[PDB]
Symmetry: D2
Subunit: 478 residues, 4 copies
């Protein structure tokens, strides 16, 4: 499979970098180089931001479109992505090491449902008419914010981009996007379909490059109105801070978590075992929603640990293009070493290994730690790799205090047949999403986001539209 | 003056340092009293009080939704009871005409409280259609402990715009008034205790910016901070939030608000509205109409009648029945104003009245400048004083570009009888509020806030609830 | 306690019937006459409708009020009802035979919560701004429907009146009310409070009288815009048909039902026994929400029947004014003879009397039927008196078909600890309200109403506002 | 004409009676085909089929929300693929200019389908805060089996305004097109089947009013009905609904809609708008501008410019690219109109053009303008539904308000003025479901439509349409 699109994307034309520089992207499954990609910088960002400003200029074609046509263009874009679903899944797998079937049936399915879902909102973005006084007409407009910058991570490259572009374009904004340096490939392909669908030049522009260079340039730009970042807490902090330093641009942040997973005695234990396994080990464990703190009630603890080890010892690891591969390699050696060091962490600290604990190329064998306590490091640091740490609890209100004691709050899951327990837990957990008797159940129509240091604002759902619009009161006196 | 101490757990406290700052009457230039000077150790005590008041099982948490509303109505009952006392303190602290604080500043607080009293049992999440065997819904939960930082120009009302939605939504608060204007907030606490609010739901720490405010903005257990004040400090607040615990942030900041006048318009209506829109609150108001664009056909007549309005504006003792304009807040502001006046002369604008102080005394003569251009300082910097600069224009598409030329975007006003002209302008002005044939037309039910660098979220109306709640998704598999 | 209000209420003035006729109202507790009431007719109706028309006329004081003042007037009325709480409760007990404490702590509490809840909606009824084309402004108004008529039954006189008047006034309509002929007293007393709160003349008018006479004049009236009826299916059918044949006025109906009460094996039996008993015998069983069909899984059945009988054998029956009286007399002899004929029915048909079955005065003692089948009379006909029948079932899917087997669908209740059983039943029961491990849990903020033949619109919650507003599209082109 | 039979369970059926009725082209004045004549026993079978398809556990009920939407998009794709065929039949059955049915009627169907396609995964209930230990929420469930009864003036489009929201929300349907205009509905049935809607989700029974329509409105297992047609039959529908099972009812009825012209209006813009608003679809329109109030001081100049617009309006064969007005729908309407015209003279209005038919053979009526009209005349009170523009005269805004609100009708209103306050004051005072300003017939799938007072009950189009096709359930849980 050959990589067509490697340049910078602006006014629906392909540009090479002003500096002339280029950077490489590698296949984590072979460690070998894939291609060279134009490396943009502050000069390239400036150009893209101009373009998106002109395309947003009042009187521009994009602004003159009627709402329903914005939806038509997103439905066409989604049509093209379905036409080329296999290519895109494959570019994604070469760049991230993800199983091809996971790329094809998950990442791409999510991009199409998201794109279609927000095409549906485009003529349904409604403000309000407000009663005040007898002789007054007062109403509200949900106007487009303007120029929106988007900065995405390496673990769900295409999908995270789509979570932003889909509501942004639906609402009538324009965009300058920046993929992670590790994985520019799909984003760039997508830009080819954006031309082929009909989007007027300048509505979407794309500058690949590095964090402290292209990304900082966006976050600090004086004529970008709004920025949406998905990635690490560390960088999220800087992005909000550069945003406020510069022009006070609006900010959406989705960051990581140490997400709890609570198993009650009265759970259906195999559903629970099955979902905590999938929740830990999906996408090589390199996923923001990973189920990295599994609390089990004392009475079913050993039976839970046992059954989980079976699942982990039997999980096929290999070449992501093999159809039976359920786990590929980590993204690169930098993550590889990060993970194994943290396994040492728990060894060094008293946790009980039950399987794995070593490498196997860039593969790490599925690892289960038994008998984990809150103060351990694999219990407080997001591991972001195939490591399942299992803890033990006695009380319902005990487990609540313990799950809520991190600084983060992205996700939680609870497993029980008991109506009163499921709901009482769902209300008390400080989490952006609480799954009950399921894990990784995501929907285009259900909002997603963090409490606390897991982030700001929401993506997906009707709630995404609040992030891409500016509210205007018009008040008329008679 | 009865209330001077730090308010925590419905109790009055001396500063942990024992220090005290003085508050002063800008009319008499005499000192009203001394107020406890808080610092970070005081803020810690208040935040802890608000945390405890917010734990699950807490009296405040276990209250009915509708009970929260009844609590807000009883408070608004109390403010209406002590309405004259409160308006009186506010006039002492700010120099504001007593009748203005009584019929405007105080009237806003009672209706704001009443409006948000009615929202308590109407904060509604969503139930979301997904799959045949899935129940998925969203809950609008309180963010938690909420910080307010308010300015000196509308001390009690800018307070209430924050306190009122916050409580309605079930949060707790730590409030910091401006060092110049602490009294009303300290009095409001006593009414909160008399109203039956459980202790710790509201805590008030008076003191200063780089001290108490900075403590509030970077605290690790404040979840959300709401700021009204200057742009320079708003940036600092958001930076502190971004760098501490990523707390949610609302900003209401200033503006350079245009006031557009077509030859079409009711000139008598425009001249008074523009006049009241520049001079209200001694010009010290976020919504001040500091850039009056007039169509040349009616230009000179506008200047003539505005000059008359200004020459006849009664300036004097705020407590006298007929005072329309009191003294500026303090000597720092006073000098700021005269210095910007002078720059206008030095740069070529045409003085038509005022330009001077009066009895040295903190009063400034109502000042009108004609022949103003966009490059001038009196046309770009926010004066916060009784200075009305009048500009000139010819075409509508010319006026739009000139008005949107700031980095600000709080407020705009348009005067015309032409249906299409009115609506075209309402759509094109990049401002949070566009008034048509009125000015300063504010309602608890219409939201308020800035485009661009004038601010971030919204206060008042239904949109204010967005800023004091967190969206959780609960997804259940069957 | 002496009745003060006996006459017809129109333009805030008391009036004798045009005919001079009057009808008596009697105390079921005694069988004796309480007083005489002016009996209106089509002539008096016509006069009331004109009052409502003039007060709803454009430019009238009522229409000139701002929305938030409609709220104040509702808060003021609620305050009056709370001030005279015990008197209204007593008038209602005199007229219905209801326990005073039930009149005081339920009926009246529901009136005060409803008045206050809909006071909060008045300045919060919002239409929409709709995006279409570049040069078009389109928005909607939720305008007031106009003159609304309201017709209530005898079993909750004040409460059912309030359920219509609170949302109707909240949205700015005007009304003509009609109590049941059996209970006019409290409706009329309320009218005196309406004058005392400050509602403009004509906003509310009351014309007591009989169904086919005053009630038909309302349903048929060419200048009433909306009718809201609570009562019998038979009369509800006629009201809708008269409304259609006349002027096509809008219609709300809340009718009766045969409401199922489903008990699973894993239910908390004592809770389930407690609520199914209370849900049958509340208000002497004379309740639209009554649990006249109790399905039990045949593992707990006899143990359910047993404990049920203990509850029925000891529920104290006596003078509604005695503190410990939990069951008063039936509304009159006509209702009395309906129930005990219906008992006979079940005897013939093979049901097992477990207790009761006889009279004692106008009192019926708690009667429980066991071994009850779908085809029995007491399983299909609304008993509307203290008769608890108990059925038996094996499957979830069986009980689902059997409960939906009616033409009615007002309420349902479900008892189980099982998360999946609760929700499955909740989604599958064709009922306007489904309770889970509770019964008769009503809130001002939660809508109420019927599926199928149990009713049409909804009452309470935001959803009631739809029944009292008319939608207008305004579309402007530039 | 490939499709003439009864559509039930995505199959085709002959009437149980074996009877058929004729449909005829109002331009040829000849018969197009025969269509099965249904009666109650066929409506029972269709209703039955709609129930089984609606049973819990049925395919349609197990689809996820988004796939319901994907189906509606898929059907809108087919309507656009066969756009010409569908617009043609419509012109054959109605007399409508082909180009009007292609660019207006058929375009409204595709946008309506596509707008409500997007709503299927966005029908959102509420969660309600009550007590510390209570979970309370609402669900917006499908009402169940829905029946539609549509008129002959916009056959396909009035059908789609009903089918689209209903399907979106997961209902099933029994449709009945008007006996004059069955063809498009039966063609639609094929496209619903080719789109892969499960059998029974949509069922179509052609036939007559006191027959099939009455059978539908009184059916004990139809849960909800949506009716567009005349007021007199709308009353009958609601009555039958009340006598049977209290099924929910939506009514879109007629109007006598005012069109108000201020002196400060763009007169050229008002003239054409007023003209196209009276004469569209040969005047046979619920939105028709059947009462043109003009201010005295542009009055006679308005009349002058309208006459010119009328005398130059090309009447003729609907398939000629330059026809702007075809023939009336049949002889019955034809006589209605002429009989209302003559009474116009009898009562003293000033004919200014038209007032007669044209051919001896044809069903064409000359564009007819009346001046010097007054509120008491019949052409000012009764709905003409034909090419007749009566122009009235007024002085005051408060006077024009009272006069315009004086009907029992209240569907639609139009105001022409440049004055911001005049515009908005009238928009609040006019008791009408839709008030246009400086435009006419400005309809969008996103904006609701329907009557005040006797012009109807509910709304169609916009989010408000979903309210008529769902049933609200509260679920309250105690902990
Ligand atoms: N040495 C450490 O302590 C440490 C800790 C954690 C992660 N890391 C490194 O960061 C990576 C985390 O992976 P990730 O992509 O999911 O999260 P990330 O936050 O590092 O990157 C997310 C997105 O933000 C961009 N970005 C990075 N820095 C930016 C900046 N200052 N301004 C604007 N944008 C910026 C990135 O190019 C990317 O597109 C790891 O590969 C690891 O090498 C290092
Ligand atoms: N051109 C200038 O010299 C300039 C510029 C900006 C601000 N200021 C000062 O601010 C005042 C403007 O009036 P204002 O009250 O409306 O705006 P402000 O900037 O002083 O902010 C007002 C509120 O924010 C608080 N605050 C101040 N500094 C803070 C900090 N570092 N962190 C957290 N909170 C802080 C203050 O206690 C006050 O309650 C002026 O009087 C002036 O002294 C001056
Ligand atoms: N006042 C009048 O003069 C007047 C007005 C309108 C229609 N009509 C006559 O009605 C016929 C159709 O005109 P229209 O389509 O505009 O209005 P309409 O109300 O008669 O028909 C609309 C729809 O309702 C159906 N329908 C008719 N009677 C029904 C009934 N009893 N029960 C259930 N459904 C029924 C029809 O088959 C059609 O589908 C014409 O023949 C016309 O002459 C007369």
């Amino acid at each position: 499979l050959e990589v067509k699109f490697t340049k910078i994307f602006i006014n629906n034309e392909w540009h090479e970098s002003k500096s002339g520089k280029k950077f490489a992207t590698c296949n984590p499954s072979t460690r070998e180089q894939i291609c060279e990609v134009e490396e943009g910088d502050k000069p390239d960002v400036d150009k893209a931001v101009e373009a998106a400003q002109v395309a947003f200029q009042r009187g521009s074609p994009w602004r003159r479109l009627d709402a329903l046509s914005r939806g038509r263009l997103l439905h066409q874009l989604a049509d093209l992505v379905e036409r080329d679903r296999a290519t895109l899944a494959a570019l994604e797998t070469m760049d991230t090491g993800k199983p091809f079937l996971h790329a094809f049936f998950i990442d791409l399915e999510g991009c199409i449902r998201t794109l279609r879902y927000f095409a549906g909102w485009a003529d349904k973005i409604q403000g309000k008419t407000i009663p005040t006084d007898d002789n007054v007409v007062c109403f509200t407009r949900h106007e487009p914010i303007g120029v929106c910058g988007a900065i995405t991570p390496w673990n769900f490259p295409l999908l995270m981009l789509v979570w932003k572009l889909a509501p942004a374009l639906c609402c009538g904004n324009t965009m300058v996007l920046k993929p992670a340096e590790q994985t520019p490939l799909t984003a760039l392909y997508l830009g080819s379909l954006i031309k082929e669908a009909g989007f007027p030049p300048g509505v979407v522009n794309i500058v690949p490059g590095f964090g402290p260079t292209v990304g900082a340039a966006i976050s600090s730009h004086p004529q970008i109105n709004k920025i949406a970042f998905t990635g690490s807490t560390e960088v999220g902090k800087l992005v909000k801070e550069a945003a406020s330093r510069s022009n006070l641009k609006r900010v959406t942040l989705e960051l990581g978590g140490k997400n709890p997973c609570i198993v009650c005695a009265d759970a259906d234990l195999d559903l629970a075992v099955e979902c905590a396994h999938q929740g830990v080990f999906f996408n090589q464990g390199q996923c923001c929603t990973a189920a990295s703190r599994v609390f089990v009630e004392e009475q079913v603890y050993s039976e839970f640990v046992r059954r989980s080890v079976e699942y982990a010892k039997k999980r096929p690891v290999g070449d992501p293009f093999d159809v039976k591969t359920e786990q590929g390699p980590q993204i690169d050696q930098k993550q590889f070493d990060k993970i194994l060091e943290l396994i040492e962490s728990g060894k060094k600290e008293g946790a009980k290994l039950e399987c794995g604990g070593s490498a196997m190329g860039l593969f790490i064998k599925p690892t289960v730690f038994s008998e984990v306590t809150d103060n351990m490091r694999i219990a407080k640091e997001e591991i972001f790799g195939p490591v399942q740490p299992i803890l033990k609890f006695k009380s319902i209100e005990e487990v609540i205090k313990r799950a809520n004691s991190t600084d983060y709050g992205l996700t939680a899951a609870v497993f029980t047949k008991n109506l009163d327990k499921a709901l009482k837990l769902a209300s008390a957990l400080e989490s952006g999403t609480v799954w009950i008797n399921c894990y990784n159940a995501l929907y285009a129509q259900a909002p997603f986001g963090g409490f606390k240091m897991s982030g700001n604002g929401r993506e997906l759902g009707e709630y995404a539209l609040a992030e891409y619009t500016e509210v205007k009161t018009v008040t008329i006196k008679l």
